[PDB]
Amino acid sequence: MELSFGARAELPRIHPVASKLLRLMQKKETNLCLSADVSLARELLQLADALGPSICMLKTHVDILNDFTLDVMKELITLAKCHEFLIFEDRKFADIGNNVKKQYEGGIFKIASWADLVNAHVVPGSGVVKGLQEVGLPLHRGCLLIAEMSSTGSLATGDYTRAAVRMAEEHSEFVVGFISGSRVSMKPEFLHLTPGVQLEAGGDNLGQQYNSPQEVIGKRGSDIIIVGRGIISAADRLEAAEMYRKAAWEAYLSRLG
Amino acid sequence: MELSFGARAELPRIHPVASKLLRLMQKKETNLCLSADVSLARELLQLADALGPSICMLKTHVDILNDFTLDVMKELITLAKCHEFLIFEDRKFADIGNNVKKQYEGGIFKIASWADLVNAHVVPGSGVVKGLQEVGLPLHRGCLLIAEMSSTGSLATGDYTRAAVRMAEEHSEFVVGFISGSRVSMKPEFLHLTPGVQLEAGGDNLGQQYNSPQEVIGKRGSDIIIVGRGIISAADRLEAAEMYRKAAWEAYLSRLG
Ligand SMILES: O=c1ccn([C@H]2C[C@H](O)[C@@H](COP(=O)(O)O)O2)c(=O)[nH]1
Ligand SMILES: O=c1ccn([C@H]2C[C@H](O)[C@@H](COP(=O)(O)O)O2)c(=O)[nH]1
Ligand code: PRO
Numbered sequence: 099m100e101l102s103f104g105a106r107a108e109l110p111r112i113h114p115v116a117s118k119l120l121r122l123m124q125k126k127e128t129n130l131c132l133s134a135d136v137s138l139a140r141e142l143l144q145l146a147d148a149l150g151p152s153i154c155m156l157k158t159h160v161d162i163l164n165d166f167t168l169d170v171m172k173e174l175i176t177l178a179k180c181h182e183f184l185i186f187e188d189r190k191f192a193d194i195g196n197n198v199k200k201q202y203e204g205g206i207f208k209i210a211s212w213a214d215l216v217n218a219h220v221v222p223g224s225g226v227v228k229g230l231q232e233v234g235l236p237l238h239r240g241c242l243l244i245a246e247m248s249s250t251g252s253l254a255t256g257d258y259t260r261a262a263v264r265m266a267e268e269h270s271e272f273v274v275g276f277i278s279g280s281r282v283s284m285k286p287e288f289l290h291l292t293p294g295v296q297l298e299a300g301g302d303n304l305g306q307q308y309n310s311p312q313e314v315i316g317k318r319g320s321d322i323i324i325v326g327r328g329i330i331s332a333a334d335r336l337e338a339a340e341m342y343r344k345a346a347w348e349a350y351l352s353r354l355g
Numbered sequence: 356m357e358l359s360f361g362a363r364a365e366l367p368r369i370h371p372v373a374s375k376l377l378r379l380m381q382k383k384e385t386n387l388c389l390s391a392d393v394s395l396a397r398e399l400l401q402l403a404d405a406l407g408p409s410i411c412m413l414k415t416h417v418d419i420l421n422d423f424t425l426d427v428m429k430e431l432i433t434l435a436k437c438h439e440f441l442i443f444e445d446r447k448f449a450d451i452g453n454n455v456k457k458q459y460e461g462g463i464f465k466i467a468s469w470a471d472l473v474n475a476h477v478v479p480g481s482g483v484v485k486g487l488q489e490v491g492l493p494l495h496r497g498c499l500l501i502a503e504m505s506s507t508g509s510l511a512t513g514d515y516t517r518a519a520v521r522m523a524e525e526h527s528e529f530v531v532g533f534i535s536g537s538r539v540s541m542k543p544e545f546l547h548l549t550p551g552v553q554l555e556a557g558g559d560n561l562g563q564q565y566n567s568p569q570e571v572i573g574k575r576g577s578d579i580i581i582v583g584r585g586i587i588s589a590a591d592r593l594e595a596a597e598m599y600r601k602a603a604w605e606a607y608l609s610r611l612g
């Protein structure tokens with residue numbers, strides 16, 4: 099009884115941000131999130147424009163953007179609306195509730211003003227979600243909980259993963275899914291996004307480990323692949339994005355049957 | 356065989372940042388870290404100047420500082436040198452190694468350029484330390500690992516805490532201690548800093564829980580208290596800082612015997 103992305107977008111308990119995302123995934127035949135891990139605004143915006151049609155989401159990394167301004171984010175929003183993708187900020191919210199509330203809304207980045215999605219670690223307990231929600235729910239935003247990590251020695255396993263799933267399921271008005279390596283929730287309203295993805299086997303020199311789109315979407319049951327260096331270190335980033343999109347999309351279609 | 360702060364500063368395996376910190380704690384009779392959770396540079400700098408003599412450390416929160424500039428941090432460094440306290444940035448590094456390396460060195464904040472200490476969550480595995488170390492060791496910086504958290508529902512317990520201690524003990528060239536609620540390492544070279552501290556019992560509305568300086572330094576064996584609202588919401592923040600300093604210092608002296 100596995101539903102297509104387009105049918106999941108209509109589920110009774112679906113969050114509006116998840117619904118918007120699932121609808122554009124189905125329309126564009128993409129379940130690829132670009133991890134835009136670049137330090138220059140011009141490169142961020144040129145990638146967003148050229149790859150926009152091929153992606154369902156762009157993961158920003160504002161903490162490394164040397165020439166960040168709120169105007170850069172305005173131009174990114176224009177591209178996101180034009181090409182139809184969501185903006186997901188990488189910042190790892192992972193503090194007591196009172197702190198994440200202020201980190202999400204304020205400072206120089208004003209993340210909640212432009213990010214459709216943010217992610218949080220569950221280690222502080224559910225106050226991390228409650229603090230974020232106090233800013234995000236009035237703004238009609240969503241959050242992803244980090245239930246598993248792709249890196250060597252990850253402690254997001256076993257009971258920790260189970261606690262992340264429970265915290266999501268109990269905060270479904272704001273939490274729309276997970277960063278995970280696999281399907282972790284049985285409820286189809288939740289999105290599973292998986293980083294640590296490359297076409298070829300391997301890793302990096304600092305604990306990253308890769309699995310293929312076919313493995314993580316097809317066998318492990320995740321919904322979306324998050325891809326950084328597999329695309330951004332390639333010469334032709336458009337062609338690379340298309341190879342990842344086609345891989346993730348076919349893997350989804352084959353599992354759906 | 357519990358050693359004073361001044362003797363711990365001379366231990367063979369002590370990290371230079373820890374040694375500097377332990378020496379000024381002993382000299383100034385303070386084991387208080389101010390959590391400067393304010394949004395205005397003028398308030399940050401006025402607190403740093405007036406409370407500098409009473410603290411061993413100031414925990415900055417640059418992600419909420421509405422008028423951050425690197426010049427603000429230069430003026431903070433002048434005060435830190437004048438009054439003799441370390442600068443500890445609150446940012447919860449909690450990503451794969453390749454990402455934390457860039458987050459620590461770059462973007463608009465350039466944290467490694469001005470922060471003596473940073474803290475990291477251990478959930479990603481030891482790549483989080485290896486990535487930070489690649490920037491921090493050349494800069495002669497130190498790191499604290501979050502082994503326990505003060506908030507309700509914290510998952511930093513049991514095997515997770517044990518993994519944080521092992522990761523610290525195996526990366527002693529860069530990791531100088533812990534954010535924890537108690538002594539977690541038996542090795543006296545490591546510093547234990549404890550947030551969630553107030554003179555009175557209670558908590559906040561978003562999962563924070565408080566224990567007293569006497570409990571966390573005296574009974575639980577921690578070295579330093581981290582105090583935010585107990586000081587910054589008080590009318591006279593200097594008097595409040597002095598009450599917390601005297602509480603934490605006496606608790607340390609009584610345990611030492
Ligand atoms: O468990 C996690 C959570 C986030 N990520 C983030 C970190 C980076 O920004 C991307 C992965 O980038 P890549 O260049 O594909 O290795 O996703 C991760 O790789 N693993
Ligand atoms: O486990 C932790 C780790 C960091 N903190 C940080 C969060 C805040 O910046 C301070 C606590 O501030 P306070 O106002 O004293 O509740 O320390 C914490 O409270 N608990
Ligand atoms: O056999 C394997 O696991 C890998 C997957 C990507 C290419 N070959």
Ligand code: PRO
Pocket residue numbers: 554555556567
């Ligand atoms: O009895 C207690 O635990 C609390 C501690 C702070 C003041 N009274």
